[PDB]
């Protein structure tokens, strides 16, 4: 409440003065304007904070609030004399002096929408779901076994090896060079996808793509570090809507280029690289905040953590997060290889990865909107609902693991979208039973530890299944063993329930 809360209630009160008649109650409005203006005169603004006080470049702030309070006097001396439009003219003069004097020392007045403008243009990647048909296509001439057993295990090991340092580096450098590194990593992914020659180029591509998917936690923490804590809810809602709209618009653009527009995959990756250059240009113009999380102590965190370690509905959901996240990402990293195996058509327009991606994003947004409304008590209904969701997941993975006829691949696509629903129904709810119990530093620590052990379990299962020197199984038997794993999870949660 240094300058920003007083400034926003001043703007709201000026809107109240603008849209009201019957001027008996505009005197309270003008004196609240005066109180909010005089409270922010000694505010010491953050862009002026680096400068020394009693400086000749500081008195412009006090002179601007001086003429501001003077025009508040000129407005209020006419509001008591029965005049109702002269107060509006003085409010217009107050608006002109607001635009002239004060807004130079204010930071920026589109910091919501520009982040929305970063939530959209940094998510337009129309060749996201079309990476795997670009590999198996006639351009790069990769086989199915080499992309199944060799390329994506490097993605798993690299995702562990960049989940270890880059979270601390994300919380360290105040989140702007980390998003810049994420944009440069996307640029590296599509440059190694365009200029690829052999398997090792694609392995380095999966290293940088693991950097991109590991830097996904940076955006919400950047919102929390930029936006004041009493405005975080609405701005976070607009930003999540912007991210979902960007992903859905990216997938719809991929369908409109590949299917309808009849655009080749090289030109598609060229357009994707162009949108990534726009993303890098927009990421260069991001303001670096100051208040980080783990750098702006440890015994206090342990004392606040130990009061809820033996609390129920926190350890079971953590183990569910680990197990179902490992299984879910191991299904997502191979569903495209399975779809290219079942439907190996040479037609580029016959590939419908973008339509399934758009339907997945839409159903995930619907089941995430239908997740906070779940007012089901968790004393007895916990393990039964989790057992039903894991049984549905095992049924859908077993449904994907037997389809070998080509013309039923349509019957695969939306079915996997249902699997894309079956996790996204319980993404906020697993948040709601974890994040609503501890402090925000402890919340970030608990979710980081859960994601870290989820990546450990996923790396162990990748080392067992898709080892180039161990099993080396094809992706059909991989989905069969994944269906066995989800069946074992369903048996465990059914034995826990009843």
């Amino acid at each position, epitope marked *: 409440a240094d300058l920003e809360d007083n400034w926003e209630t001043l703007n709201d009160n000026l809107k109240v003065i603008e849209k009201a008649d019957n001027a008996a109650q505009v*005197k*309270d409005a003008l*004196t*609240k304007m*005066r*109180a*909010a203006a*005089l*409270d922010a005169q*000694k505010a010491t603004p953050p862009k002026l904070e680096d400068k020394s006080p009693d400086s000749p470049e500081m008195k412009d702030f006090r002179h601007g609030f*001086d003429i501001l*309070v*003077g025009q508040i*006097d000129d407005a*209020l*001396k006419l509001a*008591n*004399e029965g005049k109702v439009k002269e107060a509006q003219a003085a409010a217009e003069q107050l608006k002109t002096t607001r635009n002239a004097y004060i807004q130079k020392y204010l930071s920026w007045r589109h910091l919501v929408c520009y982040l929305c403008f970063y939530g959209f243009m940094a998510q337009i990647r129309p060749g996201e779901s079309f990476i795997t048909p670009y590999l198996l296509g006639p351009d790069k001439n990769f086989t199915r076994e080499q992309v199944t057993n060799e390329i994506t295990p490097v993605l798993s090991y690299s995702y562990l090896a960049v989940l270890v340092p880059v979270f601390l580096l994300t919380d360290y450098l105040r989140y702007t060079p980390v998003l810049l590194l994420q944009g440069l990593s996307f640029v590296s992914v599509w440059l190694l996808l365009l200029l690829g020659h052999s398997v090792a180029h694609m392995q380095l591509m999966e290293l940088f793509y693991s950097v991109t998917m590991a830097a996904r936690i940076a955006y919400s923490s950047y919102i929390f570090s930029l936006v004041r804590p009493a405005r975080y809810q609405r701005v976070a809602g607009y930003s999540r809507a912007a991210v979902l709209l960007g992903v859905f618009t990216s997938s719809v653009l991929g369908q409109l280029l590949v299917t309808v527009g009849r655009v080749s995959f090289s030109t598609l990756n060229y357009i994707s690289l162009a949108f990534l250059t726009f993303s890098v240009v927009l990421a260069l113009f991001l303001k670096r905040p100051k208040r980080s999380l783990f750098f702006n102590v440890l015994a206090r965190m342990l004392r606040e953590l130990g009061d809820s370690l033996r609390r129920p509905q926190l350890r079971l959901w953590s183990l569910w997060w680990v197990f179902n996240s490992a299984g879910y990402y191991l299904v997502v990293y191979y569903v495209h290889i399975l779809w290219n195996e079942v439907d190996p058509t040479t037609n580029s327009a016959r590939v419908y990865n973008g339509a399934a991606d758009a339907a997945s994003t839409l159903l995930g947004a619907i089941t995430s909107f239908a997740a906070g409304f779940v007012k089901i008590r968790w004393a007895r209904w916990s393990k039964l609902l989790i057992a039903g969701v894991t049984a549905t997941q095992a049924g859908l993975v077993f449904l994907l693991a037997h389809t070998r006829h080509p013309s039923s691949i349509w019957l695969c696509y939306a079915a996997f979208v249902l699997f894309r629903g079956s996790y996204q129904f319980l993404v906020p709810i697993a948040t709601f039973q974890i994040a609503s119990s501890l402090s925000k530093e402890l919340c970030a620590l608990v979710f980081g530890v859960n994601t870290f052990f989820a990546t450990i379990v996923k790396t162990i299962i990748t080392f067992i299944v898709s080892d180039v020197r161990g099993l080396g199984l094809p992706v059909r038997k991989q989905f069969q063993l994944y269906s066995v794993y989800f069946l074992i999870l369903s048996i465990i949660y059914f034995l826990g329930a009843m």
Partner: antibody, heavy 124, light 109 residues
Framework: EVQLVESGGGLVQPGGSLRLSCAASGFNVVDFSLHWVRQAPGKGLEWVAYISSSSGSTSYADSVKGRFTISADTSKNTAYLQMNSLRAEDTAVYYC?????????????????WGQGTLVTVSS | DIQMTQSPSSLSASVGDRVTITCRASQSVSSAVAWYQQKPGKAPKLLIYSASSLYSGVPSRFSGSRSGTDFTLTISSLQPEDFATYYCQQYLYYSLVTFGQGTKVEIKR
């Protein structure tokens, strides 16, 4: 030194009239605005009215609105407070105080040099 | 229009006792309030202005503190001259002068 003085106070009748003089020795009334503060005997301080001789934006209290009036002359360097149809509640001591203009430091300074204050009473 | 409450309306202390007088506003009035000292019979005098600054003429044993809408006067060493009535007055505009009730300090006996 600069100071204030009040004159013209005494005893009146309910429904009568009385004019009060507030003379400022030293400073002028165009550089500092003048205020009137009521103090009932036994009660606390309360505000009546003001005048700014530069422009003129005389606003009153809710209990004296439309009943009292104020007029300041800068040639005689004084302020007159005229009261007609006085009620019985107005038996009090009236202080005439100085207060500065926005902008600057003399606005943030409060009523610094109060006057001696006159005594008015309304009785039948 | 707005109210300006003042809770310790009857204090009592001896020579050498730190006393505190609180004053609560109704709206979010900024750092512009006044503390006044009125001897019995005489005129009030400016003691504290702008809720933190000391007026030139009164000693250093008078102070003040703003905490939101709570203005607090603190007297460290109670001089026997300082037995008077202390008033709280928010000043924000020419026509929004609302005084407090008044705190009459007494001698501890």
């Amino acid at each position: 030194e600069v100071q204030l003085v009040e004159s013209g106070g005494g005893l009146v009748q309910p429904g009568g009239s009385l004019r009060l003089s507030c003379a400022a020795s030293g400073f002028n009334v165009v550089d500092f605005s003048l205020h009137w503060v009521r103090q009932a005997p036994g009660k606390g301080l309360e505000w009546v009215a003001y005048i700014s001789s530069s422009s003129g934006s005389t606003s009153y209290a809710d209990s004296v609105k439309g009943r009292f009036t104020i007029s300041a002359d800068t040639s005689k360097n004084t302020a007159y407070l005229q009261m007609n149809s006085l009620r019985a509640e107005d038996t009090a001591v009236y202080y005439c105080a100085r207060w500065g203009y926005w902008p600057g430091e003399p606005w943030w300074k409060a009523f610094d040099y109060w006057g001696q204050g006159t005594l008015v009473t309304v009785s039948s | 229009d707005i109210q300006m409450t003042q809770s310790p309306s009857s204090l009592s202390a001896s020579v050498g006792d730190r006393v505190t007088i609180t004053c609560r506003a109704s709206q979010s009035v900024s750092s512009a309030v006044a503390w006044y000292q009125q001897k019995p019979g005489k005129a009030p005098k400016l003691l504290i202005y702008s809720a933190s600054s000391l007026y030139s003429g009164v000693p250093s044993r008078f102070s003040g503190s703003r905490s939101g809408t709570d203005f607090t006067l603190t007297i460290s060493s109670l001089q026997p001259e300082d037995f008077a009535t202390y008033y709280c007055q928010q000043y924000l505009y020419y026509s929004l002068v609302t005084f407090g009730q008044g705190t009459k300090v007494e001698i501890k006996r």
